[PDB]
Design a protein around this nucleic acid. Structure first.
Lengths: 98, 87, 97, 96
RNA sequence: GGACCUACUACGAGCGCCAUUGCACUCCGGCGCCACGGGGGGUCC
RNA sequence: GGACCUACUACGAGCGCCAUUGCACUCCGGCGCCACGGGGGGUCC
């Protein structure tokens, strides 16, 4: 599987939720674990419903993976992983996450 | 017990719109919510009301999200003194 | 190789009694789902091992992601997926109780 | 609590767990951050679902708060703080 | 001190239910169920 | 209808400081900073 990283990869998110309400509600949940740099969210409505929360230090992401795993967020328990290396940066320039 | 839970110790620095939408993001798992009243008034601020359809939902919600760090601040959930507008 | 409901843990602190261990493992892996059994090796040659059997594969996969290399009794444990029936074969043989 | 201390104050602990199984599971988790002096646990009504982990050096406690904050321990995420005031065993080192 | 019985007893354990989110280091919340321990009473070595 | 302004206005918004832990279901604590939008008054094509 994937080594630790300061950014966590979230999937199984409710696609029906607008990007603005989502990115801001994700910050509402993960602001406890540390300083969030950016939060990238899947662009299209059809998209599986994914997001990236980029922390300043890996400690926050490591805690986030353990504590918020499977948390029912918008009636859907979100499935947290560690982000593959630089996938957060690659996903932004490719412009699939905003 | 009561059908609506009283939440306080909320981060006042967050706008009313972001708050109601983030609260619904958290408590939608426990049942059907009718309304969520939020106000930045001087007495009513830092607090919120979550109106559930059935009391069983509120008991699990109060049980589950007590002390939940919501915007770096663990929230204080209670039961409402009186009932809600709904009968 | 492929996913399984059971995770294979090794590099466990051998100085800890098996009784305290099984209970402390349940304290850590009960979060990822419903656990069926927790098998710990009693053997002399194969020392420092365990099996955590979850009801659903989702549980085992999440445990692998979250607790990989976690220092458990000041010793970071090394998690894998169980090799198929390897869990029951070690139980139908008494190397794990 | 903002002020660091040798002792971390843990709450939101699974109250149904026996005192012996608890301290042994807490030691199983916090022995990584340094040397633990004692782990005080009480199942009484006032101290129920709480714990104290007293470290030798504050660096141990700070690393512990940093790493295990919000960690789901017995299907319950624990909320770690710093202790209000030095533990009694600590205050016998620093003469208080 | 042991082993086997009991129209006895819930003091501990151990089960559940309710309440408690509480900063300690001078035990100690509340019920209910259950004699596994103990405690009585009894047949023996 | 456009553009280039204002010795005007903080009506919306958006920033910080202070005070605030408060039980409601019509409703707005207090200064400061800022004309992004607006609103006036203008000079032109």
């Amino acid at each position: 599987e994937t080594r630790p990283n300061h950014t966590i990869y979230i999937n199984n998110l409710n696609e029906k939720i607008k990007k603005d309400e989502l990115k801001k509600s994700l910050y509402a949940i993960f602001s406890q674990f540390g300083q969030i740099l950016d939060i990238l969210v899947s662009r299209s409505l059809k998209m599986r419903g994914q997001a990236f929360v980029i922390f300043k230090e890996v400690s926050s992401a490591t805690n986030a993976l353990r504590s918020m795993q499977g948390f029912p967020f918008y009636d859907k328990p979100m499935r947290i992983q560690y982000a593959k290396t630089d996938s957060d940066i690659i996903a932004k320039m490719k412009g699939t996450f905003v």
